[model samples]
Target: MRVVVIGAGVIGLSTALCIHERYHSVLQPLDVKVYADRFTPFTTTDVAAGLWQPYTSEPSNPQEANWNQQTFNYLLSHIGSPNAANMGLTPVSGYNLFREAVPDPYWKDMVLGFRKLTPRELDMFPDYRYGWFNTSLILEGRKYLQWLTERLTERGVKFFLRKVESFEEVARGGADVIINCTGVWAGVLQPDPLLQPGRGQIIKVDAPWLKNFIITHDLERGIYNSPLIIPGLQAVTLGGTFQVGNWNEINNIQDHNTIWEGCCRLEPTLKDAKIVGEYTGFGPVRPQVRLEREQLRFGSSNTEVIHNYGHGGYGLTIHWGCALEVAKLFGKVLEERNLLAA
Candidate 1:
C-alpha cells in the first residue's frame, strides 16, 4: 500500500518507522514516503531537550497521556546496546523539583528508580518544597533525528524534501493512506480548534561537568523562566520559556536572561559553562494528543488518514508510544479497507 507521512520531525519519522516495521512484506519493504519542507536541525524535536518528562498542555491527571510509559519502556530497550550512545540514547539520573507540594507522579515506577528528595537535599535548593529523583535516558536531539532518517533511508522508505500543501494533494498523488504527524502545523491542513502554538526557547551550553538533570515545576510562576537542566552527550540543555499563542522564533534577550538566571539558581556552575547554541520553536499545545484515524475524501475514494500530533513539548518523551498506536491503527485501516493482501 502507498503511504504518505507528513512532517519529518521525530514524531513523523518514528511513526513511519513503526508502520514500515509492522507492514513490510518478506520480499518488499513498505512503500512509505515522508514529506516535509524542513527536516532535522529545523524541526521542533531539535529544539526539545529529549528529557523523559510529561510536559504538555494537557491536564495533570495522566488518564489520556499515559502513553508516556511505553515510550520510557521502549527507549529502555536500547539501554544494553553499545551503539545506544551513538544513537543518541544515554542514561542519566535527575531530580524534578517543585516549589509547591505536589503528589507523586504516575510515572514513578516507569523509570529506573524513583525517590522523594530528602530534607537535606531540599535544603540544597532553598525554595523547592517537593522533589523526585530518578534515572532516565536523554536522547540527543541531533543524533536521534539523524539516526531515524538514516534508518528510514536504509529501509527503502522514500523521503521527499518538499512541502505537502494539503491532504488532498497527496491523496490525489495516489497516497492510499496518510499519517499526519505535522506537530505545530497540524491544524493548518486540518482545522483543529484545540491546536495552538506554545512558544518555547532553550539554551544549549557546553557543560560536560554538569552530570545530573534538575527540573523545577513551579507552576505558581508558570512556564516563563522555568528552569530545566538536562545533561546530554555533547552539551547541557538549559531552559525554558513557554508563552501561549506566541509564534516568534527569534531569540529574545529577555527570555535568555530569564532562562540563564533561573537555571543558574538550580545549578550554580551554569554561569561558567560556555554557550553552545540557542533554539526556539512552537510546541503544539492541545487539551490532549490527537491520535486516531479519520477518512479523507478524494475524487472517487476515501483515504485513510491517521492523526498523531499535538504532543506539545512531550513529542520526544511520548513519540514511540504514539507511534505504536499509529502502527496498530494502520493494520486496522488495512483490514477495514480490504487491503490485507495489498
Candidate 2:
C-alpha cells in the first residue's frame, strides 16, 4: 500500500508516523511519503506552545472526547519514557484560573490531580476568582516535530518538500491514497467552507525558574483576555490572542501588548523574563473538526483523500487520536482488498 500525506506539521507528521507503525507491523509493504511546502519551524504547530487542552466549540462531543482521552493517555505514557526529553514531552502542573464562574470542564477527569482551586490558590491571582489545578502535557513543538520526522525517516517513510497545488498533482505520482493534514491551508487544496482562520500569536521567553504553568481569563470591564504562562523544555511560552476570521499572518504590536501585559499581570515574574522570540500563526476555525474521507474525481480516475484538519489551538492536545483514525482507515482499505489475510 502507498500513502501520501499533504502536510508536515504536527497533524501531518503524526499521521505519517501512525501509518508507519500500524501497517509496518503487519509487513504490508507500506510506502508513505510526506509532501509539504514547509516543514518544522515554519508550520502552524510551531507557533503553538504545545498545551494539551481541547479548545474546540464542541468539547463534549463523543468523538472529540475519545480522541482527547487517547492523546492524553499517549502523552502520559511518554512522560518519563526513554526519549521523552528529546521528544519534548514534559508533564507540567498548573492552574486554569477564571475570573467569572464557568461550569465544570469536559476534560476535567482526563488530566492528573484535576480539582477546583481553593481560595488560597485564588489569592495568587488577584483578579481571578476561581480555577482548576491540573497536571497536563506540553510539547516543545520544534523538537517534537524533528524527532517525529527522524523516526519516520529511520523507518523508511519518505518525505518531500514541495508545493502541492491539487490532489490530482499528487495523484500523478501513482499514490493509492492521499491524506490531507493541511491544517490552516486546507482550503487551498480542497475547498472547505467550514474552515476559518483563528489568528493566534504567542511570545517565548527564557524563564526556567517558572515551573508552574498559569492560564487565566480576567474580565476587565467588558472584555475577557485569556493570558497563559506555560513552561516547556527550555523556554516559557507567554501568550496569546485568538482573533476569529483574522487572516493577517504577521505579528503586530497591539496584540503583543495584550499578551505581554496580560501575562505579566497573571505572573508578575514575567516582567523580569527575557523575551526570546515571537510567533504568529492561524488555527483553522471550524466548529466541527473535519476528519473524514473524500473521493475526488480527476478525469476518469478518483482518488481517496482523508481530510484531517481544523483542530484550531487543540492540534497538539488530540493529534494522536486523529491520526489513529486515519490508520484505522488504512486498515479498512487492506481488509477490503483481502490483503490483510494474504
Candidate 3:
C-alpha cells in the first residue's frame, strides 16, 4: 500500500512515524512518503515553547483532556535515555498564577502531580493572586524535530520536499492514501473562513540561573508570558504575544520590549538574562481538527484518505495521543479493508 502524509509539524511527523511503525511491523510492507513545503526551524513548531499543559477549545471538551494525558504518558515513558533531555523530553515542575481563582476542570486530572499553589509558593511572585502547580513535560521543537527526522529516516521511510497545493496534487503523486496535517496552511487549501492564523512571537534569552517554568495568566490583557529555563538546551525561552489574523512575519521592536517588560514583571530574575534572538510563528486557530476517514475510487485505483489537522497551539500537548488515534484508524483500514499488502 502506498500512503502520503503532508506537513512536517509535530503532529504530521508524529502521526506518520506511528503509522509507519504500526503498518510494517504487522503486515508485509507499506510504502510511505511525507511531503512538506518547509522543514525544521522554518515551521511554526520552532516558535512553540511546547509545554505539555493541555487546553482545548470548549467544543472538544473531555476528548481533548484524554488526548493530553495519553501524550504526557507516552512521552514520559521515552524520557531519560541518552540525549533525551536535549530533545526537550524531560519532566519538570510548572506553576501558573491566575489573577482570580476560577475552577479549571479542564486540566484537573489531565496533568500529573497537579495541586494548588501554597501561600509560600504564591509569595514567590508578588504580581499574581491565585496559582496552580503541576508536573509537566516540555517538548522543544528545534531539537525534537531533528531527532524525529533522523528516526524516521532510520525506519526506511521516504521524504519529498514538495508543497502539495491541492487534493489533486496529492492524488497525482501516486499515493494510495493521503493524510492532511497542514495547520496554518489549511485556511488556504480549503478556504475555511473560520480558520484564522493566530500569530505568536517569542524571545529566547541566555538565562542560566532560571530553573522552572512559570506563567502569569492575565485574561483581560490578552497577554501571557511563559518563562521556561531549559537546562538541557542551555537557553531560557521567554515569550510571547498572540496576534489573531495578523500575518506579518517580521520582528516588531515594540513587541519585543513588550514581552521583555511583561516577563520581567512576573519574574524579576529575567532582568539580568541576555536576549538571544526573536522569532514569529502563526498557528492555525480553526474551530475543529479534522480526523475523518475517507475512501476514493478512480477507475482501477483506490485511495483511503485520513484527515488529521487543525491543532492550533495544542499540537505538542496532544501530539502522541493524536498519533495513537491516527494509528488506530490506519489499523482499522489495514485490517478491516485489506489495505495492507500481503
Candidate 4:
C-alpha cells in the first residue's frame, strides 16, 4: 500500500508518523511520501511557538476541547522519558500575568496545578496585579520539526517537494490514501468558503533570565510568555496578533512596537533582549477542525482522504490526539478493504 500526506506542518508530519506506524504493524507496509510546496520554516508549524495553549473558537467547541486534552496528556507522558533530553522535551514551570479582567476559561480544569498568582507573585513583574500559574508543554518548532523529519526518514517515509495547485494535482500522486493538513492553504485548495486566515506574528528574543510565560494582559492587547526553556535556543516569542483575512506576509512595524512594549510591561528586563527578527504565518480559522475520513472511488482508482486540518492555533497543543484519531480512521478504511477482498 502507499500513502501520500500533503502539507508538512507539524500536524501533517505528526499524522504521517502515526499512519506509518500503524500501516507497518497491521497491514502491508506503505510507501508513505509527504507532498508539500514548502517544509519547515515555510510552513505555519515552523513559525509557531508550539505551546500548549489551544486557540479556541465557537464552532469546534466540544471536539476541540477533546483534542486539546488528548494532546496535552500525550506530551506530559513523554516529557521525562528516555531521549527526551536530546529531543528538547523538558519540564518547566511558568506563569501568565494578567493585569486585566479577561477570563481564562480553557485552563480552569485542563492544566495540572493551575492557580491564580498570589498578590506578591504578581508584584514580581513590573506592572502586574492579577495573573495565573500553570505547568504547560512547549515544543520549540525549530528543533522538534527537524527531529520529526529525521525520525520519519529512519522509518522509511519519503518527502516529495511539490506545489499542489488543486485536488486533482494531489489525486495524481497515486496514493491509496491522502490526508490533507494544508493549514491556511486549504482556504484555496478545498475552498470550503468557511475557512479564514488568522495571521499570527511573533518575535524570538534572548531572555534566559525570564523563567515564566507571563501575559501582560490588561485585556485589550498583550503578549504570551512561554515557560518551556530550550538551552541555546533561548529566544522569547512575543506578540501574537489574530488578524483575520490579513495575508500580508511582511512584518508590521506597528505590531513590533505594540508587542515589545506590551511584553516589557510584564517583565522590564525583556527590553534588553535584542529583537532578532519577526516571523508570521496564517492560522486556518474555522469553527472547528475537520477530522473526517472521505473515500473516493472513480473508475477503479480509489483515494482514502482523511482530513485533519483547520486547527487554527492549537496545532501543537492537540497534535498527538488528532494524529491518533486520523490513524484509527485510516485503519478502519484499510480493514474494510481487506474484508471486501477476502
What TM-score do all the candidates reach, one by one? 0.94, 0.95, 0.91, 0.89
- How do the residues 56-77 of candidate 2 rate in per-residue lDDT, one tens digit apiece? 2346347978898999998889
Q: Which of the two, 2 or 3, has more lDDT?
A: 2
| TM-score leaderboard ranking | 2, 1, 3, 4
How well is each residue in 1-342 modelled by candidate 1, as lDDT tens digits? 889999899889999998888788722435799999988888888878877777523454364455788888889998898888877898899888887767777667878889999999898788789888889889877788899999999988998887777999999998889999998898789889889898988898998988888888767667544788888888888886888788897999999998988888788877789998988889888878898999988888989999999987777888888898898898888778666734
TM-score, cand. 3 vs. native: 0.91
Model 1 residue 12 lDDT score: 92
Question: How much lDDT does candidate 2 score?
Answer: 0.83
lDDT of each: 0.84, 0.83, 0.75, 0.71
Task: Output the worst ten-in-a-row residue range by lDDT, candidate 1.
Answer: 55-64
What is the lDDT, from 0 to 100, of the residue 36 in candidate 3?
Answer: 93
Give the Cα-based TM-score of candidate 2 against the true structure.
0.95
Which lDDT tens digits does candidate 4 get at residues 177-198?
8889888777676668667887
Cα lDDT tens digits for candidate 3, 1-342: 778888888888888898888777766557887899988988898678767765422545456667777987788877767876756677777787777885764766766787889989989888778878887777888778888888888998788899787776677668877888888887565667767777778888888777678876666655343332333256777775777788998989977887788788777878788888888898777666667787776556677778777777678887787888888888788777755533
Clashes of each: 0, 0, 0, 3
Off by over 4 Å in 1: 26-29, 56-66, 223-225
Residue pairs with backbone overlap in model 2: none
